[PDB]
Structure formats: C-alpha cells, structure tokens
Design a protein around this nucleic acid. Sequence first.
RNA 1: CUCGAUGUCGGCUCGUCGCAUCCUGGGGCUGGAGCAGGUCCCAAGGGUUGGGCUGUUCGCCCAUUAAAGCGGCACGCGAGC
RNA 2: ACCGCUGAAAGCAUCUAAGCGGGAAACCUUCUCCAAGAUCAGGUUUCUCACCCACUUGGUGGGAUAAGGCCCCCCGCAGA
Lengths: 37, 98, 146, 58, 213, 174
Amino acid sequence: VKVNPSVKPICDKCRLIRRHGRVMVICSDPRHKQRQG
Amino acid sequence: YAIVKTGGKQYKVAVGDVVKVEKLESEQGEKVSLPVALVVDGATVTTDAKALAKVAVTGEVLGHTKGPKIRIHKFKNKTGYHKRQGHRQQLTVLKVTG
Amino acid sequence: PTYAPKAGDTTRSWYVIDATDVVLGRLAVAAANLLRGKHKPTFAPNVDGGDFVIVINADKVAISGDKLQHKMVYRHSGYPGGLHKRTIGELMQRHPDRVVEKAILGMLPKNRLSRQIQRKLRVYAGPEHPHSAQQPVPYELKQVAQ
Amino acid sequence: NAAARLNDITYNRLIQGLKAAGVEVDRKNLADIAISDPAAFTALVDVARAALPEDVNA
Amino acid sequence: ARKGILGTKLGMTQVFDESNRVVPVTVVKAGPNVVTRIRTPERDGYSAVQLAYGEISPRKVNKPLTGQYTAAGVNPRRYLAELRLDDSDAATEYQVGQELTAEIFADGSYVDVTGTSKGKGFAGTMKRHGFRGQGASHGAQAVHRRPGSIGGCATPARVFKGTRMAGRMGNDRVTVLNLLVHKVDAENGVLLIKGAVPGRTGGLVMVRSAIKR
Amino acid sequence: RIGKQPIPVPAGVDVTIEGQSISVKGPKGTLGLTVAEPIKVARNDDGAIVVTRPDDERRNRSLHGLSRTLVSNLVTGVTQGYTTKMEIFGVGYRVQLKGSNLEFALGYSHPVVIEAPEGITFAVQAPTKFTVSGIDKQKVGQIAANIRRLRRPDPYKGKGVRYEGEQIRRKVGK
RNA sequence: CUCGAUGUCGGCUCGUCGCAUCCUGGGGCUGGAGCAGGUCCCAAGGGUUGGGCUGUUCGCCCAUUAAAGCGGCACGCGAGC
RNA sequence: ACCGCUGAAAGCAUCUAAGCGGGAAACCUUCUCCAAGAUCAGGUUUCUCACCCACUUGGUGGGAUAAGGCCCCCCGCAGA
C-alpha cells in the first residue's frame, strides 16, 4: 500500500471504498492499493 | 408546633420553648405576638395563608441577652491593611405560649 | 440545629442491586447514593449513615461494546514505565466486580469517609451473594418525576 | 431533596409547589419538619403536588 | 504432575562422564527422607503437596508443628516445604504419610533447583549491580566504586523507584534451571546435578523437575 | 429493489422460526443462525420463506441484504452443496488424503498436514487439482483461503493454489 | 522567574523516557527473475562495540558489526566525579 | 499493519455495517523473583483455653499464666 493522507483514484478501476476507519481504495491490481492515514 | 416567623428568619417552636430571637422591641413580662408560616397538630397541618394569618404565636419577651463576641480582624496581605472590629449581636430570649 | 446525626442514631439497612442488564454509570451512581446515604433524609457529610450495598450479576453489566475494547484502565506503579494499561474488556473477563467497584469508588467523594463508606459495598459476579445472613432487600433503580 | 424523593417528587417541584401554595416556610424549618415529622413533610409534599400546574408548559 | 523433592546440598565435585569429559557437578542429598501432607485444590484451592525433610528431636519443635506432624501421622522434620502440583488433585499420585526419594529423577531428567543464595552482605552497587564505577587514577577525587548519579535535575526532581542503589543483597530465593542430573545415589542418598546449585553448602534446596525439557 | 427475494426450499425440512433463529436439516447436516433483532423472518404457507421488517432507517437495508443472503446460505447450503474447486498451479504436489485430511507439499521440505477441522470435507481430482466442501459457505471460504495464502502470490512463474484460477497476475521477469 | 548567586562546555558514572526504527519481528508496493535491492505501513522488547586525530559535540578515518539509532530530561547527570 | 472468508446497503464489487479467521521480538498470559500494612489486612492446619483479686454484680482495670515468642549466653560460609 502507498499511504498518503489525500487519497484519490489512479485509473478507471479504483473503487473509493471505506473499510474500518482508514479510507482505502482498490483497483484490484496492487500497483498502488493506496490508503488514507 | 408552629414555624413562627420572626426577624426575617423562621423558627420551629411548640408551646413552652425558648428561642433566641432578634432584638424585638419589648421589655420583660409584656407578651408579644408573632406570625407563623406553618402550624401543625401532627396530622392536621395548616398551610393556607389566610388560615395562618389567624393563627398567632405568642410569647413573653424576657432576658434581652446579647450574642457572642464576634471578633473581626480583616487583613488582606502585603497590602498592609488591618481592620479589627468586634460585634455583640443584641438578642432576646423568648417563650412560646400558643 | 439538626436532630438527624448523633451517636448510634443512624439506621443500617441492606440493599441488593441486581446489575442484570443495567449500564455501568447508572448502576454506580445508584449504588454510590445508597452507599453515602443520600437516599436518606437524616443525612450529613460528617457521619456515615447509608446502607450496605450489594451488587450482584455484575458479570453481565452492560457496557457499550465499542467501549469493552477501547476504554482503558491505567494504574501506575511508580517505577519508570510501569504504566499498566488495560482495557475493561480483559478486565471484565477477569474481574467484573473490580470494574464495578472501581466505578463506584470513583463516584464517592475523595476523603476518609469515602473509605469508611466503600467498606460497605460488596460486589459479586454470579447471582449468588453470600451475605444472606441479613434480609438484603432488592433496590432497583427508578427515575422519579418532574 | 432526600425527603422529597422519598415522596416521589423532586426538590425542584417541591419548591415550586411550596411556592405556588405559598407556605412561607424556609429550607431550615422545612428540613426540621422533614427530619422529625415525615407526616408533616408528606402533608407538605401533597400541598406541593396540588400546587403544580399541569406540565412542562405554562 | 511436576515431580519434585526437597534435599540439602553437600558441596561440589567433578565427576567424569561417559564420553570422557568433565562434569563440574553439585551433590545434593535429596535422600529418601521426604514425606508428604497433601493440599487439596478444594479445601484451599492449591493442589499442592507438603513435603517434609529433616531429622530433629521432639524436644526441638514447638507444639503446633508437632501437632501437624501427628495429624499427618509423621515424626517431625526440621524443614517442611510445599510444592505446587497442577489444575488437578487426582487423588492417587500422593498420600498423607507417603515417602519420597531422589530416585524419581532418572539420570538425565533435567531438574531446576531452587534455594536461598549466600548473602553477599550489605553489598554496594558494584558487588550488587555491576557498576563500571568511576575511574581510579585520572583525578577521580573520591568516587571510585561509587554509584555516579541518580537521575536528572528538575522534572524528575526525585529519584525514580527501583533505582539501582546499595543495599543488602544475597539470600533471595533463586531458581537455577535445567540442571541435568548426572547420577543418583539411592544407595546412600545423594543426587548429582551437573551444574551450580544456589545456596550455602548444607542448606535447604528444592529439586523440581524442569518445565522446559 | 433488494426486497424481491423470499427464500424457497426444495427439501422443506426444518425451516421454521424457533424463536428468532433458523435451522435446516436434510441431505446435509444442520446449522443455526443468530440474526439481529430488528429483522423479521417468517415462513410461507406453501412451505417457502419470507423476510422483511417495516422499518426504513438505513440499518433495515444492510440487515436486509445480509440476513437474506445468510439464510440463503443456510438452506441452500444444507440442501444445495457448498464446495469450491481449487486447482494447484506449478510443480510438485500429489495428494495423500490421510484419515480424511490433506497433506500439502510444494517448494519446501516438511509437507504440511492441513488440520482436519470439524465440519468440512477434502476432495481431490488430480495431483494438480483438489476441492473442499461443507455446509456453511463461510466455513468453506475461510478454509479455502487457508489453503490459498500458501506460497503467497508470485507473478514470475505462478505457483498458485487458486479458485479454479480466477486470473492470477503475471511477471515482469528479467 | 532567578542578580542578598538558578555553577557554563566536553568526558566519566548512573540513568531514564519518546518514536521521528540503525538492527532484530511482521508486512504492502517494487521499473521486485534468484541474491538482493529501493520505497511506504505496523512495531520500543531487547540491542545499538572497539580505537586513531580533536577540549572538541561536529566530524574524517582504521577494524568491525546483526546494527554500529535520532532525540528528551537545567543542550539529564560537578551537595556524584 | 496487512491478509481473508460470509455479505449487504447500493439486484453488483467490496475484509465491514451484523458475523467469523489469520496475524509480530510490541500488550496480558508462560517462566524467575517480591508479595495479605492486598486496612479488601486471605486461606488450610495444629496448639493453649475457666484463671485468680478488687470494685460500680457486671463490664473494667489488675494480677497469674497456657501455647508461644523474646532478653541473657555459645555461635554462624547470617550479619553495620
């Protein structure tokens, strides 16, 4: 995961889901898999 | 027993009970009548104000004692200020006969 | 002058609080009021009226689930470090009566009468209290009026 | 307050009743008849109840 | 169960082992003198056993102790120590009036031996804590062997608790673990123990089977 | 339009609300369930199942979707099987169903006997293909990912215990 | 604040705490073939050496090392040197 | 931290909302040591138990001792 506290989608497959406190994204391809804070 | 109202304060006295009440204008012997706020016969209590303006406690002023020597010594701090003055509150003793 | 507090003048009844489903704050406030003796009009902050309070079923006393895993009970030992953090979750699956007793003691005043008073509160996890020698009458909680 | 809550009324409403009824007792003697006479105090509480308006509107 | 026994230590030796090595060994007379008085996990919630060991005259012991030896049915013993057993009672492993011997430790079975140390006296912070105490020559005025400092100035305007300071060391019960018994003399009592047992020679020592295998 | 599925049942065995908990027996073993109080679950008078609760407050909806697919889990797991087909990919595995249980080996010493819990079953078809089954779909999936998560994803060749594949990634190589 | 005194640097001795982790522990990503490597996440329990030049912290270097942390506490510590 | 299953809202997809699982030298355990002044001052067991005076009978003081311990003395690889 790349953790930067200002999270956006990268490609046209990232889903800005929310998951138990941290607001992560998932494009189902762990190229970034980034997550907020 | 009745809650006599005297001196801006109120007291709870039945018949024959001494009370250190304020400096009522009076002497020894000559009685004096004092209003009530609430007079009680155990289960018959009086509450309605016009029913209490009739009920008058009465007792014999006697003794005209003084209170105890209340020593004031005001003193602030480095200010360097003392002010010492005392006080005997004038009182009177009372019996209750109503 | 008062007539309420004197020698041998205060009465000693007993109380059983079933901490069945109640929440911890209401439970502890209720037990604390019974323990100090403010439920009594013959009250004074110098004397110890009040009733021996027993708290039973304190094993299942309600706390927010989101608090059984967050709210912590620290207790320092003087030694550097030695801060013994501990949530009420493990503290509950170890000593729920210690949790309850802690809350109650925290709601009492902070003085020596606080000690003489808290020596009157028993708390047990199961339903089964041993102080049945008396006639411990169940006191359950009731918001009043207004 | 303790004797009031023994009579299921709170101190606030007790005072508001003893005011609206008007029995010019004061907290000192009110507490004395509270201690010695639960009877006279419960008469006072019924006085206060009978002198509360209706509700929390007015 | 954790097979333990009492005993005193008679001193050290060296014994040569199978492979022609040396065994700097301690001799512990755990001899067949250890009797019991069970401790139920129901009356008092232990599941422990009361091992006795010693030889004293009746005249030497006071009435409570001899009463406990009589109620157990045994003739008194200078020591009377206790050993935890388990989450279980099992009602057949021991008995009140039983007899033990060093024979349970079966020549290789690692023991862990516990006992009070030799008092190293009122020992200062270098016999007690290993302080690389301040220098000895380069001007050090008087502070060779002396502690040094105890904390900092104004926020801990106080010495923290548990500060390493001078004080009476020694005598504290210590447990030296995993001492592989080299031999067992059930024919005159002793139990050899490849290692260094804590305590004065001729002092109480509880030889418990290990926990670490 | 989540609320357009009340549960049917082929075998129709034990499908009735014994006090806000459901259970189903039949061709498979049985199961329980502890559904939240603000759910309503009822039966249908031909033997089917129905579910709702007339509160509309944004937890009704979450519990709606879940509760429904979880009771489906129950009944269409007892009657209809629950089983997942996991194909070994790569080199070197040939099964020993010892007792009823699986022993893995790929790419290191010490073949690993994967514990045989209560209420599963291990199945194999080849050296490089097996599958699991049970009654509880969550049980099935959790053990099926216990079997996966073995020799973690590597894209450079692929040594994947997969779920009949499902598109493992690929290399960048050398 | 302290001037009718709060003894200043470095070293030593003794610490102690923080996490902004050098190592050891678990991980995600990698333009990560393997070795590794580089970056981000969690993690403070331990550990974090010896010398040469310098009053020197600062450094530079030698030989290592798992690694040879960065800080706080009156730039911790002189009624301890 | 991260990983994961079941799974909606939001006919899907999601580790999350209900649920469950993995998960580290870090936390409680496990171990070694102190420890009931833990005043919440614990427990199992054993031992001794009239024991004589005076009052205001009594309690209340006294005295006598039980069991026990101490002080003396001979010591210690225990110790200022």
